[PDB]
Amino acid sequence: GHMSGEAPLTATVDGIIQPMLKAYRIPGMAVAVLKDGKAHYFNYGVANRESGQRVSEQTLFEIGSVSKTLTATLGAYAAVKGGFELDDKVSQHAPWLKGSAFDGVTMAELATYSAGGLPLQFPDEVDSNDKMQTYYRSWSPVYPAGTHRQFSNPSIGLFGHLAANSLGQPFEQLMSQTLLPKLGLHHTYIQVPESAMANYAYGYSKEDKPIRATPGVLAAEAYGIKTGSADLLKFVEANMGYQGDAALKSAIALTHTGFHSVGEMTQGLGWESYDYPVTEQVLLAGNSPAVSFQANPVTRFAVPKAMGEQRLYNKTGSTGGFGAYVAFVPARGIAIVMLANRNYPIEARVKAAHAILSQLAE
Numbered sequence: 001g002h003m004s005g006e007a008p009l010t011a012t013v014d015g016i017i018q019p020m021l022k023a024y025r026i027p028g029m030a031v032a033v034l035k036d037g038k039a040h041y042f043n044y045g046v047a048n049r050e051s052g053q054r055v056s057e058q059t060l061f062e063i064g065s066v067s068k069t070l071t072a073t074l075g076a077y078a079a080v081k082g083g084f085e086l087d088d089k090v091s092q093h094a095p096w097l098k099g100s101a102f103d104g105v106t107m108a109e110l111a112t113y114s115a116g117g118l119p120l121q122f123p124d125e126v127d128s129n130d131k132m133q134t135y136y137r138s139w140s141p142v143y144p145a146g147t148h149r150q151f152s153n154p155s156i157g158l159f160g161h162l163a164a165n166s167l168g169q170p171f172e173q174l175m176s177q178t179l180l181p182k183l184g185l186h187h188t189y190i191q192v193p194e195s196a197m198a199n200y201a202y203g204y205s206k207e208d209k210p211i212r213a214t215p216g217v218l219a220a221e222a223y224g225i226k227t228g229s230a231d232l233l234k235f236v237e238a239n240m241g242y243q244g245d246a247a248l249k250s251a252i253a254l255t256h257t258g259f260h261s262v263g264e265m266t267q268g269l270g271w272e273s274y275d276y277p278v279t280e281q282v283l284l285a286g287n288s289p290a291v292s293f294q295a296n297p298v299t300r301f302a303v304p305k306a307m308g309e310q311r312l313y314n315k316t317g318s319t320g321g322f323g324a325y326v327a328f329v330p331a332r333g334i335a336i337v338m339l340a341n342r343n344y345p346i347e348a349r350v351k352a353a354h355a356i357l358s359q360l361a362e
């Protein structure tokens, strides 16, 4: 429909989301959108299947790799505050990495998954800090630095860890005591406090059992965040146009810089972006396993470039029991957050988000 208003918007969102929840047996979903910069909220189903607690915009969901947009923002903030420069070698900020392959990898390459084939996940027995250091010290590059994109927890994890260390504070502390309060995200956590536990959904695994994320090496950096639709939309709004702390503004802007592309997707700090308008087929391809999660040679940029407001920025994320998607278009005043307590197919996330974004654009 080519008309706007509360009536067509609700017809579209309910019409897109309700069938999808049935098709994938999603217990609960929180959805929030921006249109002309104004927010609308839709909640469906249950946070906890046993208790029947209903999802609201306060329900906490694991957002998986969407956490990496906050990790990247924290890393950008530390760069703006002078802790490191993006072209710095990684071992300039980790004395224990001098004389390793990380003498030849930049902080930017580590943040953008282009260090040379760091894997999706740490090997299973890299499960302590000591083992982690040995792991990176001994790592042998699969590809030359800057040439290939391979999405990787170890890569963005180390970026966030070292960025925090450059300011002399642990990552979780910097996130919880500085980044989140300055962003005004008061119900967003890496470690959910006992007072907020009643709002934390359970995830429902592929075997249909309750599950939540567990501690792990660089888990905070790679997949640490639990949040609701209202807080996550607030973070989106800070990305649509932020006025305030100059340092935080600069940091957010730095997450909108493009470093290289794979096909029609441009990799920034945290956020991945597209042209806007963008077709459903392109958005699906950019988020498909072949592109998003396997090794690809990149189209290198001569210099990193501010991608600007006429872009669709996005990120997918998942954990064992949860499936999240966020997309926004700063110039157009439109965005979508979709948080669910099932890890359901990214293709379904993208098709639903595209359809809703097309109505928001009217």
Ligand SMILES: *C(=O)[C@](NC(=O)Cc1cccs1)(OC)[C@@H]1N=C(C(=O)O)C(=C)CS1
Residues within 6 Å of the ligand: 063, 064, 065, 066, 120, 121, 151, 152, 153, 222, 223, 293, 316, 317, 318, 319, 320
């Ligand atoms: C981000 O969603 C992703 N996963 C996480 O951050 C959380 C985890 C899920 C399993 C172990 S940690 O970043 C690595 C996705 N994780 C996987 C994966 O299952 O290895 C993907 C293939 C998509 S990226």
Ligand code: NA
Residues within 6 Å of the ligand: 160, 161, 171, 218, 221
């Ligand atoms: Na850390």
Ligand SMILES: [Zn+2]
Residues within 6 Å of the ligand: 001, 002, 362
């Ligand atoms: Zn139209």
Ligand SMILES: [Zn+2]
Residues within 6 Å of the ligand: 006, 009, 039, 040, 041
């Ligand atoms: Zn409304």
Ligand SMILES: [Zn+2]
Residues within 6 Å of the ligand: 125, 127
């Ligand atoms: Zn072990």
Ligand SMILES: [Zn+2]
Residues within 6 Å of the ligand: 161, 165
């Ligand atoms: Zn360290």
Ligand SMILES: [Zn+2]
Residues within 6 Å of the ligand: 180, 181, 185, 186, 187
């Ligand atoms: Zn607070």
Ligand SMILES: [Zn+2]
Residues within 6 Å of the ligand: 252, 253, 256, 307, 308, 309, 330
């Ligand atoms: Zn921007």
